[PDB]
Amino acid sequence: LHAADDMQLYKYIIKNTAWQNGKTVTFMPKPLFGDNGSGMHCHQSLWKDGAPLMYDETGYAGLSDTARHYIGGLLHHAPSLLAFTNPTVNSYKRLVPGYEAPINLVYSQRNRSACVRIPITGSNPKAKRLEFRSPDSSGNPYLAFSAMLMAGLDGIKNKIEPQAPVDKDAASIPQTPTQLSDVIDRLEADHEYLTEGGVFTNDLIETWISFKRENEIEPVNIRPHPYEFALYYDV
Amino acid sequence: KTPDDVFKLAKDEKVEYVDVRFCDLPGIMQHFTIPASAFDKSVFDDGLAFDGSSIRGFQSDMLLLPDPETARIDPFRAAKTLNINFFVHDPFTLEPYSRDPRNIARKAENYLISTGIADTAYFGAEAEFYIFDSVSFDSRANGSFYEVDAISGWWNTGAATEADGSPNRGYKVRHKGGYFPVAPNDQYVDLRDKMLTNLINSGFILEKGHHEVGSGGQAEINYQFNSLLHAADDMQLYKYIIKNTAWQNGKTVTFMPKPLFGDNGSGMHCHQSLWKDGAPLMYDETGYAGLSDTARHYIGGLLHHAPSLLAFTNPTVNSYKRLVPGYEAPINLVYSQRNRSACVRIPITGSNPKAKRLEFRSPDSSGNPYLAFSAMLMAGLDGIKNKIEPQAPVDKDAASIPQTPTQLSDVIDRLEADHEYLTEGGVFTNDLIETWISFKRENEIEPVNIRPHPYEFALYYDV
Amino acid sequence: KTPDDVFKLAKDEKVEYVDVRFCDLPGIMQHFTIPASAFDKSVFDDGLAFDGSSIRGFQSDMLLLPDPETARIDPFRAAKTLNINFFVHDPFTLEPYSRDPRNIARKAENYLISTGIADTAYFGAEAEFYIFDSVSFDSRANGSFYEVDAISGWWNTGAATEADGSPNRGYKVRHKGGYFPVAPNDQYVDLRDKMLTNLINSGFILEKGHHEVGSGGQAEINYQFNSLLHAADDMQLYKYIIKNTAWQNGKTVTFMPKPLFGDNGSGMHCHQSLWKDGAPLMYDETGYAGLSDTARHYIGGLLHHAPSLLAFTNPTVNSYKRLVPGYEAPINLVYSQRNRSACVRIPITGSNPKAKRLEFRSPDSSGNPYLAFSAMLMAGLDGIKNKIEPQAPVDKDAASIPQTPTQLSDVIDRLEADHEYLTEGGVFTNDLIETWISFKRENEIEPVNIRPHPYEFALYYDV
Amino acid sequence: KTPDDVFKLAKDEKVEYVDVRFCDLPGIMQHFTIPASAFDKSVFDDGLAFDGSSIRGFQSDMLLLPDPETARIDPFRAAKTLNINFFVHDPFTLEPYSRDPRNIARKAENYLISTGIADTAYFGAEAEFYIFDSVSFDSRANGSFYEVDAISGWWNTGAATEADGSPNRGYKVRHKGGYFPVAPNDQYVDLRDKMLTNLINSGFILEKGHHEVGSGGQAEINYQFNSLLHAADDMQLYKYIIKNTAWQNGKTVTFMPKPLFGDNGSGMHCHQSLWKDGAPLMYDETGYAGLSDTARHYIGGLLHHAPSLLAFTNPTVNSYKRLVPGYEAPINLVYSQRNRSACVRIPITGSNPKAKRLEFRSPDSSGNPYLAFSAMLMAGLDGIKNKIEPQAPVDKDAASIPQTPTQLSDVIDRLEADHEYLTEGGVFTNDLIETWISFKRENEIEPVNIRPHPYEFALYYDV
Ligand SMILES: Cn1c(N2CCOCC2)nc2c1c(=O)n(Cc1ccc(Cl)c(Cl)c1)c(=O)n2C
Ligand SMILES: Cn1c(N2CCOCC2)nc2c1c(=O)n(Cc1ccc(Cl)c(Cl)c1)c(=O)n2C
Ligand SMILES: Cn1c(N2CCOCC2)nc2c1c(=O)n(Cc1ccc(Cl)c(Cl)c1)c(=O)n2C
Ligand SMILES: [Cl-]
Ligand SMILES: [Cl-]
Ligand SMILES: [Cl-]
Ligand SMILES: [Cl-]
The CA distance from B74 to B81, in Å, is 6
Q: Which residue among D260, D447, D455 sits closest to C447, beta carbon to beta carbon?
A: D455
The enclosing domain of C69 has a CATH number of 3.10.20.70
Query: Pairing mode, if any, of strands A47-48 and A51-52?
Result: antiparallel
**Contact criterion met (CB < 8 Å) for A234 and C157:** no
Indicate if B80 and B131 belong to the same structural domain.
Answer: no
Inside any domain, residue B169: yes
The candidate with the shortest Cα–Cα distance to D324, out of C409, C139, C446, C441, is C446
Which residues from A are below 8 Å from B when comparing CB atoms?
26-35, 88-90, 93, 96-98, 137-139, 178, 216, 218-235
Q: d(Cα D344, Cα D360) in Å, to the nearest integer?
A: 5
Q: Alpha-carbon distance C174 to A82, whole Å?
A: 38
Q: How many CB atoms lie within 10 A of CB C448?
A: 21
Structural Rg of chain D based on CA atoms? 23
Short-list D85, D104, D89, D105, CA closest to D56 = D89
Of the candidates D254, D246, D332, the one whose C-alpha atom is nearest the C-alpha of residue C452 is D254
Say if residue B66 is in the same domain as residue B161: no
Which residues have C-beta within 8 Å of that of residue D225, sequence separation ≥ 6?
D122, D123, D124, D125, D231, D271
- Of A203, A225, A234, A220, residue with least CA distance to A88: A220
Cβ-contact D25, D104 below 8 angstroms: no
Residue D460 lies in a domain: no
Distance CA B196, CA B245 (A): 10
What's the rounded Cα separation, in Å, for the pair D299 and D358?
8
Asked if the peptide bond before residue A162 counts as cis, ω within 30 degrees of 0, the response is no
Would the CB atoms of D59 and A120 count as touching at under 8 Å? no
Q: How far apart are CA C132 and CA C155, in angstroms?
A: 13
Query: Atom 3, ligand 1: which residue's CA is nearest?
Result: B124
Ligand of minimum distance to the alpha carbon of C213: 2
Q: Is D293 helix (H, G, I), strand (E, B) or coil?
A: helix
CB atoms within 10 A of CB C163: 12
Q: Which of the 8 DSSP states describes residue D254? A: E
* Within-domain flag for B459: no
CB atoms within 10 A of CB B323: 26
SS3 B414: helix
Q: How many CA atoms lie within 13 A of C61 on its CB side?
A: 9
* Partner-chain contact A90 B456, CB within 8 Å: yes
Domain boundary among C100, C124, C145: C100
Give CA separation, D93 vs D61, D62, D90, in Å.
12, 11, 6
Method of determination?
X-ray
Which residue's CA lies nearest to atom 3 of ligand 3? D124
Considering every ligand atom, which ligand is closest to the CA of C357?
2
Give all strands (DSSP E) within B248-348, no chain letters. Answer: 252-254, 268-276, 279-280, 332-336, 342-345
Q: How far apart are CA B295 and CA D106, in angstroms?
A: 85
DSSP state of D442: I
CA distance D99 to D107: 11
In a domain, A233, yes or no: no
Question: Around B433, how many Cα atoms within 13 Å sit in the side-chain half-sphere?
Answer: 23
Q: How far apart are CA D324 and CA D272, in angstroms?
A: 24
Q: Is A13 exposed, middle or buried (0-12, 13-18, 19+ CB in 10 A)?
A: exposed
Dist CA B167 CA B188 (whole Å):
18
What whole-number distance in Å separates Cα of residue B333 and Cα of residue B312? 17
Subunits in contact with chain A (3 or more CB pairs closer than 8 Å): B, C, D
Chain breaks in chain B (C to N over 2.5 A) after: 59, 397
> Which residues in chain D touch residue C445, judged by CB atoms under 8 angstroms apart?
none
Residues with Cβ within 8 Å of A214's Cβ and at least 6 positions away in sequence, in order, are: none
| Ion ligand 5, residue ranges at CB < 5 A | B 407-409, 445
Q: End-to-end CA distance of chain D, in Å?
A: 66
State the helix-helix crossing angle for A202-212 and A180-189, rounded to 10 degrees.
160
A158/chain B closest Cα distance in angstroms: 34
Domain count, chain B: 2
Cβ-in-10-Å burial (0-12, 13-18, 19+) of B211 comes to exposed
Residues in chain C: 463
Q: Answer with the one of C66, C100, C134 that is the final residue of a domain.
A: C100
Q: Do the strands B212-215 and B62-73 form a parallel or antiparallel pair, or are they unpaired?
A: unpaired
Ligand nearest to the CA of D445: 7
Amino acid at B379: A
Do B86 and B111 have their domain in common? no
Distance CA B223, CA B207 (A): 8
**Is the residue at B376 inside a domain?**
yes
Query: Which residues in chain A are contacts of C170 at CB distance < 8 A?
Result: 233-234
Question: Helices B228-248 and B189-201 meet at what angle, rounded to 10?
Answer: 140
Three-class SS state of B112:
helix
Cβ atoms A78, A160 nearer than 8 A: no
Give the residue, out of C225, C275, C356, C377, with the most ligand 2 atoms within 8 A of its beta carbon, to mutate for a pocket test: C225
How far is Cα D51 from Cα B375, in angstroms, rounded to an integer? 53
- Among A129, A75, A139, which Cα is nearest to A107's? A75
In one-letter notation, the amino acid at residue D290 is: G
Q: What number does the ligand 1 atom closest to the CA of B347 have?
A: 5
Q: What is the 3-state secondary structure (H, E, C) of A131-156?
A: EECCCCCCCCHHHHHHHHHHHHHHHH
Q: Using CB atoms, which chains have 3+ pairs under 8 A with B?
A: A, C
For A204-210, which contacts have Cβ atoms below 8 Å and span 24 or more sequence positions?
Answer: A208/A83, A209/A83, A209/A184
Q: Are residues B320 and B225 in the same domain?
A: yes
- State how beta strands B332-336 and B226-227 pair: unpaired
Residue D362: CATH number of its domain:
3.30.590.10
Element (H, E) at A67: helix A65-85
Measured between CA atoms, the residue of chain B closest to residue A16 is B462
Q: Which helix (H) or strand (E) holds D193?
A: helix D189-201
- In this structure, the number of other CB atoms found within 10 A of the CB of residue C87 comes to 20
Same domain for C229 and C173, yes or no, is: yes
Please give the Cα distance from B98 to B56 (Å, whole number).
11
Name the DSSP class of B37: G
Which has the closest alpha carbon to C209: B51, A118, B370, B291?
B51
Q: Report whether C271 belongs to an annotated binding site.
A: yes
- Chains D/B: 3 or more C-beta pairs closer than 8 A? no
How far apart are the two ends of chain A, measured CA to CA in Å? 54
Q: Is residue A230 part of a domain?
A: no
**Antiparallel, parallel or unpaired: β C143-149 and C134-139:** antiparallel
- Chain centroid to Cα C393, Å, comes to 26
Going by DSSP bridges, is the β-strand pair B144-149/B134-139 parallel, antiparallel, or unpaired?
Answer: antiparallel
D9 membership: H or E segment, kind and range: helix D3-12
Within 10 A of C277 (CB to CB), how many other CB atoms are there?
8
> What's the CA dihedral at D413, D416, D419, D420 to 10 degrees?
-130
Q: Are D450 and C324 in contact (CB under 8 A)?
A: yes
Residue D236, H or E segment = helix D228-248
Contact B201, B162 (CB under 8 A): no
Measured at the alpha carbon of residue C267, what is the angle toward residues C263 and C270, in degrees to the nearest 5? 160
- B144 Cβ contact partners less than 8 Å away, ≥ 6 residues apart: A33, A226, A227, B137, B138, B451, B452, B454
Q: What atom in ligand 2 is closest to the CA of residue C231?
A: 28
**In-domain check, residue A234:** no
D366 and D387 assigned to the same domain:
yes
> Residue B429 burial by CB count (10 A; 0-12/13-18/19+): exposed, middle or buried?
middle
Strand pairing class (C134-139; C81-89)? unpaired
Candidates B24, B192, B229, B190; CA nearest to B108 is B229
Q: Is residue D128 part of a domain?
A: yes
In terms of residue numbers, what domain contains D8? Answer: 2-100
On whether both B282 and B381 belong to a single domain, the answer is: yes
Instruction: Inspect the interface and report whether the beta carbons of C449 and D27 lie closer than 8 Å.
Output: no
| Amino acid of residue C104 | I
Does the beta carbon of D211 sit less than 6 angstroms from any atom of ligand 3? Answer: no
Same domain membership, residue B134 and residue B45: no
Among residues D431, D219, D439, the alpha carbon closest in space to that of D316 is found at D439
Query: Where in the sequence numbering do the catalytic residues of C fall?
Result: 51, 126, 128, 212, 220, 269, 340, 359, 361
Statement to judge: residues C10 and C27 lie in one domain: yes
The residues pairing with C59 across neighbouring beta strands, listed in sequence order, are none
Q: Are residues B24 and B108 in the same domain?
A: no
Closest to C38 in 3D by CA, of C68, C96, C82: C82
* Residue D8, CA distances (Å) to B170, D74, D316 in order: 79, 16, 41
Q: Does C218 share its domain with C96?
A: no
- Reported as type and span, the H/E element at residue B448 is helix B446-449
The C-alpha angle D314, D317, D320, rounded to 5 degrees, equals 60
Alpha helices by DSSP H, listed for D249-285, are none
Give the Cα separation of B287 and B264 in Å (integer).
Answer: 35
Give dist(CA C23, CA C87) in Å, integer.
9
Beta bridge partners of C269: C126
State whether the Cα torsion C379-C380-C383-C389 is positive or negative: positive
Q: Which pairing describes strands D81-89 and D72-73: parallel, antiparallel, or unpaired?
A: antiparallel
Task: Judge contact between B242 and B141, C-beta under 8 A.
Answer: no
- Last residue of some domain: C57, C85, C100? C100
CB atoms within 10 A of CB D315: 29
Cβ-contact C290, C356 below 8 angstroms: yes
Strands B358-360 and B268-276: antiparallel
Report the DSSP beta bridge partners of residue D175: none
Looking at the structure, tell me whether residues C397 and C447 fall in a common domain.
yes
